[PDB]
Amino acid sequence: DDIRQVYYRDKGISHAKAGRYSEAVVMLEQVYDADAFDVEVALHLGIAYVKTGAVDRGTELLERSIADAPDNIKVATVLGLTYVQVQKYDLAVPLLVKVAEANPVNFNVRFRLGVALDNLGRFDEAIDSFKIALGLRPNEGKVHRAIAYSYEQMGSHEEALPHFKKANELDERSAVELALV
């Protein structure tokens, strides 16, 4: 059975890495096995299941993966980001903390970590994360806006206002620039 397993594994992972998610599901389903667990197969089929609309199914494979390989950052990134997308903000936080510590130049991860924290009512911590994201991309208007909103939710209107104004200044630079390309 090994020749057969390795055929569907290699072909499936190839499809998934190329963005051929549907063909990745078709192939990797024929090798994935919960008892003889393989993290690279579970990761790619998880990705493929989320991309093709089986988001609960996919996240469950990613959860089984992160249980088997707790320090795998590529799993943690997918799964943490996917949690924010379905508002499982509380599960998202520990994964995104760990990914941000390992890849400190990943803007999206730090941004979504802030969003998760803000949703959980941890406004000072969200702001901390938003400020680190802003260090990475200081011309991101959405980050000042997110920081303004977290302040406002604490009743810190004085600290919010300069952030709203800066976000507006930056959004004017940005969306106009993109439309002129």
Curated annotation (Swiss-Prot):
It is found in: Magnetosome membrane. GO terms for cellular component: magnetosome; magnetosome membrane. Coiled coil: none annotated. Its main location: membrane. Disruption phenotype: Normal magnetic response, many fewer magnetosomes. MamC is mislocalized in punctate spots throughout the cell. Deletion of approximately 80 kb of DNA, including this operon, leads to cells that are non-magnetic, lack internal membrane systems, grow poorly, have reduced mobility and take-up and accumulate iron poorly. GO terms for biological process: magnetosome assembly. TPR repeats lie at residues 5-38, 39-72, 73-106, 107-140, 141-174. This is Magnetosome protein MamA. The chain holds residues 42 to 217 of 217 of the full protein.
